[PDB]
Amino acid sequence: GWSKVVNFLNKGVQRRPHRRLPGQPHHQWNMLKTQLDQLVRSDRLELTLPRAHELQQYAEELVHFAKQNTPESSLIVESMIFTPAARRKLFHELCPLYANRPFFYTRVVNQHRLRMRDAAPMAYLEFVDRPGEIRPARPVGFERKQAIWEEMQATRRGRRQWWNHAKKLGLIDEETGDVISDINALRRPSAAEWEESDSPSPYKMVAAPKRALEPFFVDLPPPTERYRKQRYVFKRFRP
Amino acid sequence: AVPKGKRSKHKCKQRQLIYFFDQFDGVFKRRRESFYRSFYNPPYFSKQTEQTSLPPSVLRPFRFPGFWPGRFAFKMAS
RNA sequence: AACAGGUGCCAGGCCAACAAGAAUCCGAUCCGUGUAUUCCGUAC
RNA sequence: UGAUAUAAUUAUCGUACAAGCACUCAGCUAGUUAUUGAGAGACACUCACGAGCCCAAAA
RNA sequence: CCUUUUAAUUGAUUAUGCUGACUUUAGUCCCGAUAAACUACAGUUCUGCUUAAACUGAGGAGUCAAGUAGGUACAAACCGUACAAGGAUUAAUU
RNA sequence: AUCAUUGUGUUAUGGUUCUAUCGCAAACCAUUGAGA
RNA sequence: ACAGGAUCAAAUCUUCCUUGAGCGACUCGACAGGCAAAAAAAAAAAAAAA
RNA sequence: UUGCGUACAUUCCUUAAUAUCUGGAACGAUAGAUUAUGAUUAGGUAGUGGAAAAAAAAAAAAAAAAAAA
RNA sequence: GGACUCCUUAACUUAAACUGAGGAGUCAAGUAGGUACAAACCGUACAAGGAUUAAUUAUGUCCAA
RNA sequence: AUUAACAUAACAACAU
RNA sequence: GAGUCUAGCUUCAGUUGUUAUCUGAUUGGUAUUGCAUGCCCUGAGUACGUAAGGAAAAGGAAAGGUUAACCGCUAUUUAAACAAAAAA
RNA sequence: CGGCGGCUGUUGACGGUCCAAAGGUAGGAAAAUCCUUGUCGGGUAAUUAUCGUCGUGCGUGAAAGUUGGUCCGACUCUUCACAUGUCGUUUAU
RNA sequence: ACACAGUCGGUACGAAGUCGAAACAAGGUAGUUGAUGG
RNA sequence: AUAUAACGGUCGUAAGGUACGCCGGGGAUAACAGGUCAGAUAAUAUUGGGAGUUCUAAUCCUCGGAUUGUAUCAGCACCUCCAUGUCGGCUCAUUACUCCCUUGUUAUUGAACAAGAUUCAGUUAGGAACGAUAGUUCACCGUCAGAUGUAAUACGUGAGCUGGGUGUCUGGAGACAGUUUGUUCCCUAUCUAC
RNA sequence: ACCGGUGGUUUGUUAGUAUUUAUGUCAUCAACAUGUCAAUGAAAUAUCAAUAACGAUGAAAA
RNA sequence: GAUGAUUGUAUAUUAGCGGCUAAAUGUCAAUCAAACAUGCGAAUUUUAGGUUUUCCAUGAAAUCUAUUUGGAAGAAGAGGCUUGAAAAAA
RNA sequence: UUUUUUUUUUUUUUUUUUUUUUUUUUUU
RNA sequence: UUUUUUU
RNA sequence: UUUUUUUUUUUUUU
RNA sequence: UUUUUUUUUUUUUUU
Questions:
Q1: DSSP letter for each residue of A45-71
Q2: Closest nt by CA–C1' to B13
Q3: Are A100 and A189 in contact (CB under 8 A)?
Q4: Most buried residue among A70, A104, A171, A198 by CB atoms closer than 10 A?
Q5: Which domain of life is it from (chain B) (predicted)?
C-alpha cells in the first residue's frame, strides 16, 4: 500500500457501533455466545483489542439481566449461555458478588504489544473484584460510605471537598453540624448474607480461606491438573 | 496500458525517499512509541515457553552505569 | 632446437648406481635454474 | 543569467517522418581461394633471359 | 627494439541475430468455501456430512495405481515397516 | 569555474568467463642373442 | 500614550501643534503544538494533580 | 540632397597533391630537411584510385658508439 | 525510363501536388545567410584547417534586433 | 581468482 | 517571534452608461426593477370594426419541467429493547 | 443419362405465317424463389410486420418429387393470460 | 534548467584610508563648487 | 519444301477455378474513406424575363455574371493507410449562425382589430414531451399540442457499452475530477587561531 | 637377411582428446547441465598459544 | 437421451502414392486440402535484412535500341571520365 | 433510530458566497 | 527637414 | 452641436 | 496631394 489511501478514503465516514466479524450473522452470534460462556468460565481472557472491546458489550448485559431474579429475565439469561457450568457459576458466585454493584462489572486492559506471528494488538478482558485481579476495585455501598468518612476525618481538604456529598449520605450530624462519630451505626444487612432460620466429632472440617478443608488427605491433583492432553500435534510435510 | 519508456535513475532515487518518509510517518514512528510505553509495566511472560524461558521478573536493568548513582552491589555477609 | 624428467620459476656440469664448478659479482623484502665474467666434460 | 541548436541508421524524387530494428553490457559473427585465368580505347604492379623462353611425372 | 614474411580469415552502435548477465515497468498484481477454548476448587463449545463393529463354525464382497504417500524428538534428515500356521496354552512369571 | 539541494569528480567494496593432463605406434633407424 | 512642545493660558471634560498611516486591528512574550492513547461523517466534547 | 548596419581573404600562421603534361628533362645524392610575394588547388552520394596504421608470432645479426661507471 | 520552378504547349472542369513533351537553374550529391516555423526561391570572391579584422548583397534603418 | 553493464558507500565544492 | 478577524488581488456572462441653475420660515428635494416558454383572471367585452370578430401598459396563480438543499409530514427499507430507590 | 419458343390480327373460343424431336401438363403461386411497402378483409389509438384471398407483376414446376385430408413438433412468425426494477428512475440490509 | 539534457561567452583587489588635497580659481569652510536668462 | 502475321523470329494450336489458403514482399476491400481540387451545387447581392396585372423591387418563380464557402453528387492522382452496408443505437459533451418560441413602444407592408409574411440589430438571458411497424430514411399516418423544432467536432465519442450484414489488454508520462501541517518537532550540519 | 630383447626419431614442440549421468518424447529421435581427484600455501612433517591486548610460523593471514 | 443406431471394459486389426468416414475436407499422439523422425539426397529465391579502421585524389545517371515492356533502374549493348591550360620588362 | 425519492423548500446575491498569501525586504 | 495650385 | 438616439430627429456645413 | 506596405510573428502608428 501507500498509507495515504487510508486517510483519503476515511474522510467523511461514520464509525460502526458493532464491529464486523468473519462469517454470516448466524455464525457471528454463535461465536460471541460461545466466547461469553468461555469468559464466564475463565476469569480473564487474552484477546485482540478490537474483540475485547466488542465482547464487553454482552459481558455487562449478562450480569445486568442475571440479577433481576424474575421469570422474564431468567429467559433472557438462558438465551445467552450454553454450558451448565457457566450457568452455575453465574448464579452462584457472580450474582452474590455484585449485589451492591450498580453496573460496570468488567474492564479492558491494553498490553501495548504486538503478536509475534501476526503483529496484532493484545488485551485482557478480566472481571472486576475477583481474586488475582490486575488492579484493585473501589468499594460500593456501606464500604464506600466508610471510605468517605475516613477520608473526611483524615484531613481538612477532604472534609471540605466531601462536605456537600456527605449530607446526602447522612455522614454529617445535623443536630451539631459535624461529621458523624460512630460509622458502624449505618450498618445494614445485605442480600449476600444468609437470613437466620430461627461438636466432638473427629471428622470436623477445618476452616480455610476460600473453602474449608477435610480432615483427611486424598491423593488427587487439582481440578486443573488431573486431565492432560497434547496442546498441538505436528503435521509432517509431504514433499 | 503498457509503459512507453524506461524510468531514469533520478526518478527512482526520488521515489525511494518518498516511500521511506511515507512509511516512517505511519508505521515505524507509531510502533516505536507503542513499544516504549510497555517499559513501565512488567515484562511479558509466556506460559508456553516456560520449558526454556527464564523465571519472571519485574525490575528493569540500567544500561548506563555511568549515570547510575547510589549503591551498585551489597557486601557479602560473614 | 641440451623439452629428458625433477628439484619452489627458464639447469650440459645437482637428484637420477658411468664424464664435468657447493665457481665469482650483482639482487627490497625472498628462496631465487635470473644479469655480467670465466673454467671444464663431450664418439652423450 | 544572455545568445544559439530538429537522437542515429537504411531505402526513397523527397531533411522523406509519427514507416522498419534496437533497455544496457559481455563473448561469437558476413568478399575465403589461381600447380587451372588475365589487360581487350572506364583505367592493370614488377623481376630474369632474349629470337629465343619453360620443362612434365619418375629422381 | 628495427627490418622481411604470414591461407589470422585478421576491424562492429544496428541483421525483432546466437549464447549469458543485469535494470525499468515494480514493495504494483497474486492469498481457495467456518472457527474457538486449554481457567484462581466438579462437568458436555459451535457448525457441515452421516455405512463408524475388528472371532462368534464362513480370511472383513472385488480390481488398479503408489517402482512402498496416515511409523518416528512442532525433522522435507537418519533409522524402520509387507509373516495366509497368526507363534503370547502369557490363565503363567515377578 | 552554477555543487544553489536531488548533480558531477576521485577513490574504495561488491558482482564477474574459470585452462593443474592419468597420454604418446602398427612406421623408420641403431645395437644385441641363438641357429642357417 | 494626553506621551512631548509653544502661549499675558482652554467650562465641568486639552485653545492649538507634533506622532509620515502611534508597526493593517487587538492581544501575547514560560507565547505557540507536531506525534501517541482514547474518541471521531464536518465539527464539538477532558483544569491540574503516575 | 550628405549617410549607415551586412555573408564570404589561401593579407598573417600550419598541412596535403600517384590514371604518364605544374616549373621538375631542375638541384642534390651514402639511399632527399617541407620551395620565404609560386601558378592551379583542396563541398560531395554512386562508382574508381593512392597512401599511412592495426601493441602479436616466425628469422640461428640485441654491444666496433661520446661522457660516466 | 526524376521531384520543384521559368517560357512554350498537349489533356482535364483554361480545374488538381496529377498525365505526358521541347530547353536553362537548383536539389538530388550544398554548409553557414535572407524569406517567421521542414530540400527546390535570392545571394555567394560558396564549408583543408586555427585566431577578438577590413568589405555594398538579398536586403534593412520606431521597439523586441 | 576474474573486464563491462549493474548495486551501495566515503571524501572533495560557496560570487551565494 | 506567535494566535484571531481582516485590507488588496483573484471569481459564470459582460459594461463605463450618474450630480449646470439651486424651496427666502410656505410639512421638501431622482433611489435595491438588467430577465424573456405556454395557459387562466382584473383591466375588457373596452380601443378597433357594417357584422362576425376581438388588443396593450401592471399585477396576481394553478399545472408541467430543471438545479440545489433538507428529514418537520407521507411512502419503501431497516435497527435497537440495560443502571429513578444511599435498604438496592 | 442436358431439358422443353417467335411475329401478328379480332377480354379475344377463332383466323395468318416462321421454326422444332417436343414445343409447361396439372398443382402450388408476393414464394428457402420476384420484390427488402401489389389490391381487399380480420387485430390495435397507428400495422408496410403477419393470416385469409385474388391469380397480373416477375416467374417455379410432377417417383427430378408437385399438391395435401387427419395426426404429429426443441421450426419461423402473429396474437391472448399471471407475475415481474426490462423500464421513466432510481433506493435500504 | 524554458532546452534531445549541448556549445560560446561569463564577475576587474586597494580610499573599508584620512595628521589629505599646496603650488588653477572661487569659497555660504561643505576635502564644497565651474554649462545654461526660453 | 512447311511454321514462327505474338512477324528481335522456342508456339511445340498445351485451359479455368479456389469463400480450404500457406510463404515472400508491397499498403488498394467491388461509390477510390480523409486531405487537396470546386464541374454540378450552397450564401449574399445584382441584371433580363414571367407572376402579384392598378403596380418592375409588400411578396414569389426563373436566367447570366462576379465574390465567398463546400454541406451533398460525379470524378479521383504520386499523397495518406483502418479493416463494415465506408453506420444504426445508448452514455457523456464542446463550438458557430439574429438558429424553433420569448425583445426592438411607433411608419418595410395589398398593417382596420385578432391572427400573419420578408429583412436587420445585442452587453449572447431563460426554454423546447412520446409511441407502433424495423424497408439502412423520406412524403405521410395516431397522442400530450413542450406548439412549422439546422450544422461542425475522424459514425464527435469502441484500451465506455452494442446490434438479425445495403479479438484481447492489471494505466508508466499529458489532460481533466478529488487531496496536501510546517521555520522546527527522522538523521546530519565542529568558529576564530596565540 | 627371418625371429626374440633394449634404445632413439617421425608422426606431434606447428595438430589435438572421446569412456561415467541429471533432464525431453509412447516410440523413432535430440542434446557440450553443474570450475579441479583439491581450503590456501614451495613446504601443513609450519594450521602454535589463548580471555581482551601484546604474542608464534610463513614472502604474504584474523 | 435414459428398454435402445443404451452405455461401459481386458487383449486385438486397418499406416501416408495411405487408412477411417450414418460424408463435415471431420479424424489418425492437443492448428494435417495430405501426419511425425533422419538425411555428406550437404535447398531454391529478379522480393527482402545485414555487411566492421582513418586520410586523401577524381567524380555519375534516372537517357536510347532490343526483351509480345513491365516497375520499386532486372539482364545484354551503346552513351557519359584525366582535354586543356591560366604566371612577363623598352 | 438511520438512508432515499415517491415527500418538503428555494430559484436570490456576482464589488455576492468563499479562500491556501500583510507586500517600503533592491541580492535568506 | 512635407510638396503642389500657369499667366 | 444638444444623453436627441432599439429601425425615430433638430441645429450648423466644420 | 505625398511619406505608411501582405507591417498578415508581436507592440506601435508616436506624421
A1: EEE-HHHHHHHHHHHHHHHHHHSS-SH
A2: F6
A3: no
A4: A171
A5: Eukaryota
Please judge whether A3 and B26 are an interchain contact, meaning their C-beta atoms are less than 8 angstroms apart.
Answer: yes
As given in the structure block, the three cell numbers for residue B5 are 519508456
Closest by Cα among A18, A80, A30, A100 to A54: A18
CB contact under 8 A, B38 and A2: no
- The three cell numbers of residue A118 are 501476526
Query: Resolution of the experimental model in angstroms, please?
Result: 2.9
Cβ A50 vs Cβ A120: under 8 Å: no
Strands (E), chain A: 44-47, 106-114, 121-127, 172-173, 178-179
Q: How far apart are CA A21 and CA A55, in angstroms?
A: 12
Q: Considering only CB atoms, which chain A residues are within 8 Å of B23?
A: 3
Cell numbers for A165: 456529598
Going by C-alpha positions, the residue among A99, A3, A74, A91 that lies closest to residue A40 is A91
Closest chain B C-alpha to A110 CA, distance in angstroms: 10
For residue A119, give the chain B residue with the closest CA: B31
CB contact A216 to B (< 8 Å): no
Orientation of helix A71-78 relative to helix A49-66, angle to 10°: 150
**Rounded Cα–Cα distance for residues A183 and A149 (Å):** 8
Q: Which nucleotides of N are covered by protein (CB under 7 A)?
A: 159, 169, 171-173, 178-179, 186
> What's the CA A214/C1' K20 distance, rounded, in angstroms?
127
